[PDB]
Amino acid sequence: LDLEKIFSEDDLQLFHGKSRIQRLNILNAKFAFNLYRVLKDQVNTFDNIFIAPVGISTAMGMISLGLKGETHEQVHSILHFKDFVNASSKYEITTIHNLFRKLTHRLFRRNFGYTLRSVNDLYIQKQFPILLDFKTKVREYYFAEAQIADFSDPAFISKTNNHIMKLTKGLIKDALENIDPATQMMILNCIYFKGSWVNKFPVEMTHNHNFRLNEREVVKVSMMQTKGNFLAANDQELDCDILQLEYVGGISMLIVVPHKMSGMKTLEAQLTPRVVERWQKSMTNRTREVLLPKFKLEKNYNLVESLKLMGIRMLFDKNGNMAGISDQRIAIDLFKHQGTITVNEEGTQATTVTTVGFMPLSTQVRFTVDRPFLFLIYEHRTSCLLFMGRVANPSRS
Amino acid sequence: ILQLFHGKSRIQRLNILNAKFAFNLYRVLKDQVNTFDNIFIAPVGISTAMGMISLGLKGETHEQVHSILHFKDFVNASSKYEITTIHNLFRKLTHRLFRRNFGYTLRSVNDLYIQKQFPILLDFKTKVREYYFAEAQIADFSDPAFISKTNNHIMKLTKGLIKDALENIDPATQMMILNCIYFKGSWVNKFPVEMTHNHNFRLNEREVVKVSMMQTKGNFLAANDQELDCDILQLEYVGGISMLIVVPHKMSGMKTLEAQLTPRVVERWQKSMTNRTREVLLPKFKLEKNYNLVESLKLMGIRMLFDKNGNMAGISDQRIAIDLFKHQGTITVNEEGTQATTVTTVGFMPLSTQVRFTVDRPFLFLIYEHRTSCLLFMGRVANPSRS
Ligand SMILES: *[C@@H]1O[C@H](CO)[C@@H](O[C@@H]2O[C@H](CO)[C@@H](O[C@@H]3O[C@H](CO)[C@@H](O)[C@H](O)[C@@H]3O)[C@H](O)[C@H]2NC(C)=O)[C@H](O)[C@H]1NC(C)=O
Ligand SMILES: *[C@@H]1O[C@H](CO)[C@@H](O)[C@H](O)[C@H]1NC(C)=O
Ligand SMILES: [Ca+2]
Numbered sequence: 001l002d003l004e005k006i007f008s009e010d011d012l013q014l015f016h017g018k019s020r021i022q023r024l025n026i027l028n029a030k031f032a033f034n035l036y037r038v039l040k041d042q043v044n045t046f047d048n049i050f051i052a053p054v055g056i057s058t059a060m061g062m063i064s065l066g067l068k069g070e071t072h073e074q075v076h077s078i079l080h081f082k083d084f085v086n087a088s089s090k091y092e093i094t095t096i097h098n099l100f101r102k103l104t105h106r107l108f109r110r111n112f113g114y115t116l117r118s119v120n121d122l123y124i125q126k127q128f129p130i131l132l133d134f135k136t137k138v139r140e141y142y143f144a145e146a147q148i149a150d151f152s153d154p155a156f157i158s159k160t161n162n163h164i165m166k167l168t169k170g171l172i173k174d175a176l177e178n179i180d181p182a183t184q185m186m187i188l189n190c191i192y193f194k195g196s197w198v199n200k201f202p203v204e205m206t207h208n209h210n211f212r213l214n215e216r217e218v219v220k221v222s223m224m225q226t227k228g229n230f231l232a233a234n235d236q237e238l239d240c241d242i243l244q245l246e247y248v249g250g251i252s253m254l255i256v257v258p259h260k261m262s263g264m265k266t267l268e269a270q271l272t273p274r275v276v277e278r279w280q281k282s283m284t285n286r287t288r289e290v291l292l293p294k295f296k297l298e299k300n301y302n303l304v305e306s307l308k309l310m311g312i313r314m315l316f317d318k319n320g321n322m323a324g325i326s327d328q329r330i331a332i333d334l335f336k337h338q339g340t341i342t343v344n345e346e347g348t349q350a351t352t353v354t355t356v357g358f359m360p361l362s363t364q365v366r367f368t369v370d371r372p373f374l375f376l377i378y379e380h381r382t383s384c385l386l387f388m389g390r391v392a393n394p395s396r397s
Numbered sequence: 398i399l400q401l402f403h404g405k406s407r408i409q410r411l412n413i414l415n416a417k418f419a420f421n422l423y424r425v426l427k428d429q430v431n432t433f434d435n436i437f438i439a440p441v442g443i444s445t446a447m448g449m450i451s452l453g454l455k456g457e458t459h460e461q462v463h464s465i466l467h468f469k470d471f472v473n474a475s476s477k478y479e480i481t482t483i484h485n486l487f488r489k490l491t492h493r494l495f496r497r498n499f500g501y502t503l504r505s506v507n508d509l510y511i512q513k514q515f516p517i518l519l520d521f522k523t524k525v526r527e528y529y530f531a532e533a534q535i536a537d538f539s540d541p542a543f544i545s546k547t548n549n550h551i552m553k554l555t556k557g558l559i560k561d562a563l564e565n566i567d568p569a570t571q572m573m574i575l576n577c578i579y580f581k582g583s584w585v586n587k588f589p590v591e592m593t594h595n596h597n598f599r600l601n602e603r604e605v606v607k608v609s610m611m612q613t614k615g616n617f618l619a620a621n622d623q624e625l626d627c628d629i630l631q632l633e634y635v636g637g638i639s640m641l642i643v644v645p646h647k648m649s650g651m652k653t654l655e656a657q658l659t660p661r662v663v664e665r666w667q668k669s670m671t672n673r674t675r676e677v678l679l680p681k682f683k684l685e686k687n688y689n690l691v692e693s694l695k696l697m698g699i700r701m702l703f704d705k706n707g708n709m710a711g712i713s714d715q716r717i718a719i720d721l722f723k724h725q726g727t728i729t730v731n732e733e734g735t736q737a738t739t740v741t742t743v744g745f746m747p748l749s750t751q752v753r754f755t756v757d758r759p760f761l762f763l764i765y766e767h768r769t770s771c772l773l774f775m776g777r778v779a780n781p782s783r784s
Contacts, residue, residue, distance in 0.1 A: 007592060007612065009749040210749070234621055236669045241752075259671065259751075282623045286646065289753070362597070365628075366676070366753035 010207070014277055015087065021106075022383040023087065024099045027080040028057040029273045029385045034078075036388060038309045039301070040268055046213070048396055050297040050389035052191035052339050054107070059120050059189045059335070061100045062142040063315070066134040066324030071314035078311045101141040103382060108143070113249025114195035115349075116379075116386070117167055119175075123149035123160075125184045128328045146325070152181040160188075168192040171340050171349065179334065186334040189303075191386065193377070196347030198246035199228030200354050201292070203345045211293055212371040213393055215261045221293045221394045223368075224345055227359040230290060231283040232367065235275075238267050242279045243290065243367055247347060251386070254279070254376040255292065257369055264372050268390075276376070289366035293394035296342045303335040341387065399474050401664055409770040410474070411486045413660045414467040415444045416772040420658045421465075423775060425693045427655060433600070435783055437684035437776035439578035439726050441494070446507050446576045446722070448487050449529040450702070453521040453712030458701035465698045488528040490769060495530060500636025501582035502736075503766075503773070504554055506562075510536035510547075512571045515715045533712075539568040547575075555579040558727050558736065571717050576724045578773060580764075582634035583734035586615030587741050588679070590732050598680055599758035600780055602648045608680045608781045610755075611732055614746040617677060618670040619754065622662075625654050629666045630677065630754055634734060638773070641666070641763040642679070644756055651759050655777075663763070676753035680781035681732070687725040694722065728774065 015023050032053035043049060060079045064072055076082050076093075085091045108118045122138070124130055126148045138146045150156045157176045164175040168190065175188060201224040209223035231244040240258040247253070254276070258267050304316055314320035318331045342349055377387035402410045419440035427436060447466050451459055463469050463480070472478040495505045509525070511517055513535045525531045537543045544563045551562040559577055566573075588611040596610030618631040627650060630642040641663075645654045691703055701707035705718045729736055764774040 003591060007614075233623075234669075234671055236620075236671055239671055259673065282621070284621055284623055284626060284646065362757075364755050364757060368751050370749075370751060 010209075012087065014273060018383070020095075021099055021103055024084055024096070024103070025382055025384045026273045027084050028053060029276070029383075030083075031057060031078070031080045032385055032388060033271045033273075034310060035303075035306060036271070037268065038306045039303075040390070042306065046392050048295075048297050048299075048389065048391050048393060050299040050339060050341055050387070051301070051337060052189070052387050053385045054103075055118065055120065055189045055191040055339075056303065056337060058100060058104065058118070058142060059187055061096060062120060062138055062144055063122065063187065063332075065097065065137045065141070066131070066322055066326075067315065068321045068323050071321040074312045074314055078307075097137075097141040101143075103384065104141075104143055106382065107379065107384065107386075111249060114247060114251060115169075115192070117192040119164055119167060119188060119190035119192070120144040121188050122146045122325075123151075123183075123186050123188065124326070124330070126150055128184065128326045128330050130326060131324065134325050151176075151179060151183045151186075164188075164190065169194065169349070172338055175336075175338065179336075183333050185330050185332050186336060187332060189335070189337045190339055192339075192349075193341070193386065194347075194349035195247035195249065195251060196350055196352075197345075198248055199226055199230065199290075200347070200358065201226040201345040202357075202359065203353065203355065206294065206345060209291065209293075209368075210370065211394060212261075219393070219395060223291050223293050225289070225291045226345075227287070227289050227363045229285055229360075230288045231285050232288065233279045233283045235279060238270055238275070239263055240267055241367065242283075243288075243369070244283065245290075245292075250380045252378055252380065254378065255369060255373055256375065257371060257373040259371075261372070264374075264390075264392075267374065271374075286365055287360055287363045289363040291366075291368040291370075292343075293369060293391070294344050295391055295394040296340070296397055297389060297391070298340045298397045300336070300338040303337050304332060307335065339387075341389065401660060402474065405770070407482075408486055408490055411471055411483065412490075412770045412772065414471045414474075415440065416660045416663070416770075417470070418444060418465070418467045419772050419775060420660075421697065422690075422693060423658070424655065425696050426688070426690075427777070429693065433779050435682075435684050435686075435776065435778055435780060437686040437726055437728055437774070438688070438724060439576070439774050440772045441490075442505065442507065442576045442578040442726075443690065443724060445487055445491060445505070445529055446531075446574050448483060449507060449525050449531045450509065450574065450712075450719075452484070452524045452528070453518075453709060454702065455708045455710050458708035461699045461701055465694070484528045490771065491528075491530050493769065494766060494771065498636060501634060501638060502556075502580065504579040505530065506551060506554060506559075506575060506577040506579070507531045508575045509533045509712075510538075510563075510570075510573050510575065511713070511717070513537055515571060515713050515717050517713060518711065521711050536570075536573075538563075538566055538570040551575070551577065555727075556581070556736075559725055562723075562725065567720070570720045572712075572719050573721045573723060574719060576722070577726055579736075580728070580773065581734075581736040582636065582638055583737055583739075584732075585633035585635055586613060586617065586677075587734070587745065588613040588677075588732035589746065590740065590742070593681070593732060596678065596680070596755075597757065598781060599648070601759075606780070606782060610678050610680050610757075612676070612678050613732075614676050614750045615674065616672055616747070617675050618672050619675070620666045620670040622666060622669075625657060625662070626650055627654055628754065629670070630756070631670065632677075632679075637767040639765060639767065640730075640735075641765065642756060643761040643763070644758060645760075648759070651761075651777075651779075654761065658761075673752050674747050674750045676750040678753070678755040678757070679730075680756060680778070681730055682778055682781040683727070683729045683784055684776055684778075685727045685784045687723070690722040690724050691719070726774075728776065 205225040208220040211221040243255040592612035595607040598608045
């Protein structure tokens with residue numbers, strides 16, 4: 001059997017039947033992919049991407065509690081909150097907020113199997129007062145806080161960073177670092193996720209395996225390898241494979257791998273809630289040997305320009321209308337969205353190691369993630385898109 | 398209904414109805430055998446044999462055949478088509494398939510044997526030849542010289558594959574149809590011979606057996622069927638012919654797939670297929686089947702053709718009915734291809750594969766000729782270690 005060494009290559013349609021929350025999340029997902037479409041054009045084609053959609057949508061829903069007129073409407077049409085209140089006459093703007101309140105309590109309250117935490121705050125220079133009505137509704141429907149701030153006082157910068165560092169179990173340590181002290185109003189958005197794989201990867205099987213970066217160049221990456229039951233699907237139209245990795249607790253990661261290098265662009269341009277639904281319904285259960293590169297993404301963006309490209313402009317102009325937030329003229333200077341995701345043999349943001357034996361003895365198929373791929377992290381019960389990212393190069397952050 | 402036809406050529410449309418008959422015949426034939434037995438038939442041969450025979454039938458006798466063979470669905474599918482369209486199409490198909498071809502050998506044995514007592518109308522004899530390359534021959538099932546001559550002739554034709562074509566046949570036989578399709582092809586993606594090894598193969602929910610499993614790498618098209626929960630792998634032969642491997646995920650899946658298989662289903666698989674570089678494990682096997690399709694054809698609805706009170710007026714002047722419809726065939730699948738006699742040892746596998754697919758459980762296989770969409774063969778491998 002020296003052959004195994006030689007053979008080896010080593011060395012509405014959608015809304016039908018969906019709960020009210022799921023519908024909202026279908027719209028939030030639609031926005032997310034549109035946002036991604038815009039974000040991707042602001043980064044190199046060879047860079048990885050990582051964002052937490054539910055965090056962005058929740059930040060916009062919250063901020064809008066204090067917006068009015070066109071300013072408010074640009075935000076609601078583009079976030080697609082409109083499409084929702086329109087889906088039926090039994091809804092309304094307040095419905096969006098109540099639904100978001102339920103989602104937030106449901107997602108960010110102690111849960112079994114994983115840790116989901118949200119940082120959704122608004123910081124406003126102490127010179128501009130914050131209307132109490134806005135302050136309580138934010139805390140009421142989003143459990144968030146509109147805090148008074150002082151971007152020129154290192155005591156404020158320091159306090160916030162430590163808060164976020166604790167909240168994210170030491171993951172995010174520089175939330176408000178390198179921020180212009182002349183800032184008047186900013187949004188800090190960050191979702192923290194810690195979970196473990198239903199099908200873990202035995203640590204001794206991780207090894208160097210070739211990963212294709214583009215049509216003509218490959219690199220070595222730490223490749224994890226495991227066996228187990230996984231749902232998977234193929235998309236003939238977009239020519240890509242979709243593998244579903246389950247975390248304990250009702251949360252999964254969809255690994256979307258386009259067969260061709262020129263396929264990524266098409267997939268990114270085509271990705272919508274319907275496409276995802278299509279993949280979900282054509283999924284099948286199989287015993288699979290799965291090879292996945294481990295990776296760690298550390299991203300930090302300012303979404304103001306992306307939101308501007310999509311059509312939300314008044315909210316970023318002192319001439320916009322935020323009479324619901326302050327009686328004084330202000331506007332968002334920075335919409336900071338930061339987050340990290342570490343994928344290893346145990347799960348995500350894992351701190352434990354599992355050495356016991358647990359793989360099935362044989363597997364009918366195998367799928368090797370050896371080329372650029374997109375990943376989507378969903379919460380099953382609510383069909384909520386928590387995270388989304390592109391891994392163009394697993395050896396880069 | 399027939400939205401399948403959209404885009405298809407005229408020969409393809411006929412071969413679609415031909416395939417429809419094939420799956421119905423399969424459905425009927427599988428109930429005449431054991432759930433654990435393997436099955437192997439050559440659909441194209443059966444359809445062409447029935448088309449030929451029909452040139453000599455009339456009335457309800459003729460109607461049953463064109464009906465159960467779905468020849469009726471074909472003409473009834475376009476005002477442009479008529480009964481002679483079937484025959485014109487079969488002559489073109491027969492010539493394209495059984496004439497010298499590149500990459501593979503495809504030979505046909507479509508004969509009708511009639512006791513020498515009953516004469517054969519010369520008219521029917523020529524049309525049979527002119528449209529199906531069929532031979533309405535004179536016979537003597539009591540003279541061993543005849544049996545022997547026929548056996549040696551088929552043995553030569555099938556390159557030594559079929560040796561007992563007319564063995565164990567009732568001498569009192571008056572008229573019969575001998576039907577075989579000989580095929581020899583080589584894989585586009587062969588299997589390295591040293592990689593073949595014993596591998597566990599699922600026979601059913603309860604038992605597993607060891608079989609000779611081949612292992613290779615290469616580019617293959619494959620699809621996934623969520624409704625039937627089956628995987629479909631396409632194995633290309635040199636020359637535009639391919640074997641489709643249909644593996645239901647669950648044991649109980651075989652029954653459903655066999656019950657649901659239709660031209661539309663296959664069409665769906667084809668449209669959903671993608672190309673990948675895969676590691677493919679496939680068990681080698683050898684099917685040797687010999688059936689008398691009379692019973693099956695009767696169960697399907699063709700009865701007059703098999704009774705003296707039938708109308709075979711165009712074949713002969715005297716009263717005669719088909720006594721036996723013999724369909725015999727053999728298929729061997731190895732590292733080189735099918736019915737191969739050569740061995741390839743040169744290196745040829747790609748260096749890496751993105752996916753792997755192990756055929757470790759019961760499966761069905763369909764062999765199609767791409768240009769004409771002709772279903773040459775179809776079978777069931779319930780146990781690769783059985784014939
Ligand atoms: C994909 O299909 C596999 C089946 O091959 C599913 O795995 C099986 O999941 C069930 C449910 O968790 C397990 O069976 C149950 O086990 C519990 C205790 O372990 C027992 O109390 C129940 O009566 C039942 O037997 C099973 O162990 C597990 N593995 C097996 C036997 O295959 C898997 O959940 C499916 N994944 C999907 C549909 O997402
Ligand atoms: C799969 O791709 C290979 C080249 O990568 C090509 O030779 C083959 O024809 C493709 N599959 C098809 C269409 O048979
Ligand atoms: Ca490897």
